[PDB]
C-alpha cells in the first residue's frame, strides 16, 4: 500500500461502461466502469462536459478520489456525478481511449 501523502497517477489504459449510467432519485448519475489495464492502482479521470473540444468540466464529480484499486486486468469501479440540467457528456478517462455517454437531466 502507498505511503501517506502519495497520490496515484492517472490510469493510462482503456475504460468501458459495464452498463448504462443510471439516474438516482435526486438526479445524480452513477456509473460503473471496467478497466483494461494492469497499471493499477491508479486514479480514474471522470467529469461531465458540454464541449468535447475544450473538455471544460461542467457539473461536478461527486466521488472523492475515484480509483482503480487492483493491479489485475478488467477490474471495475463505481463513481457518481452531478450533471447540469439539460444535455451533457459523461467522460471517463483521458487521452486516446476516453469514453463518452450522452446524458440528459430533466427538470
Amino acid at each position, epitope marked *: 500500500m502507498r505511503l501517506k501523502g502519495v497520490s496515484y497517477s492517472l490510469c*493510462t489504459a482503456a475504460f468501458t461502461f459495464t452498463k448504462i449510467p443510471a439516474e438516482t432519485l435526486h438526479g445524480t448519475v452513477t456509473v460503473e466502469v471496467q478497466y*483494461a489495464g494492469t*497499471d493499477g492502482p491508479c486514479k480514474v479521470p471522470a467529469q461531465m462536459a458540454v464541449d468535447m473540444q475544450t473538455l471544460t468540466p461542467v457539473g461536478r464529480l461527486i466521488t472523492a478520489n475515484p480509483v482503480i484499486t487492483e493491479s*489485475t486486468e478488467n477490474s471495475k469501479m463505481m463513481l457518481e456525478l452531478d450533471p447540469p440540467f439539460g444535455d451533457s457528456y459523461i467522460v471517463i478517462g483521458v487521452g*486516446e481511449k476516453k469514453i463518452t455517454h450522452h446524458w440528459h437531466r430533466s427538470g
Partner: antibody
Amino acid sequence: QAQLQQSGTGLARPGASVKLSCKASGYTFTSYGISWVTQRAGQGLEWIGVIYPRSGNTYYNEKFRGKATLTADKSSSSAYMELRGLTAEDSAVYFCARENYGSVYWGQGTTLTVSS
Amino acid sequence: DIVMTQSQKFMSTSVGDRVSITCKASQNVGTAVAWYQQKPGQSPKLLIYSASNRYTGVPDRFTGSGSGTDFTLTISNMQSEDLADYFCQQFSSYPYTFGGGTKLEIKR
C-alpha cells in the same frame, strides 16, 4: 511511440514447433496485455489468447489450448507464442497486438507456411 | 463463449453511399465492442472503440453505434480508400472474439 515488432520462422514441416516473438517498445510493457491473433489466407481474424506481462496471467481461446503457449519476459519487454504440432491447417498469418479494449498497436504479422 | 455474427460477408458499394455494417453478439456485451478495418498485407487498424467512440485520426465518416447485442458501423459518404475488410470484436469476457468480417468492394 508504442511499437510491436514480430519475428519467427516462416516455413515449417508438419509436427514442428515454432516460437514466434513480439518485441515491444515505446510504452510500459507491464501496463497492458499482449494478445495473439491468427488469420488464415482470405479468412477472418481469430483471437488465440492473451498474456498480461505484469503477472504472467494468460487466458486462452479453448480452440487453441495446447496448440499455442503464450509466455512473456518482463526484463526485455518481449512476448512469445509457441505453436506446437504444426499441421498444414496451421498455415496462417499470426499477429501480436497490444490489449486495450480495442487494439491500436499491432505487430506486422508473421506468415507461417506448414508443408511436407 | 460469445459469438459475434457479421451476417454480410461481402458488400458492394458506390462511392458516396451510406454503408451499414452489422455485428450481432450472441449475448449481451454492453458497449464492449471495437471495430477495425484491414487492408491486404497489413495489420488491422482500430476505427471505433467501446461501441461508439471514434479513434483519433479516423475520418469522421466512420461512426459506431449500438449497445447490448446489436452494433452498427456506419460509413457515410464512402470513399474508395474505405474498401477493406471490416471486423467487430467484443471485450465483455474471454475469449475476445471477432466477427467473421465484412469485405467492402466497389460497384460498377
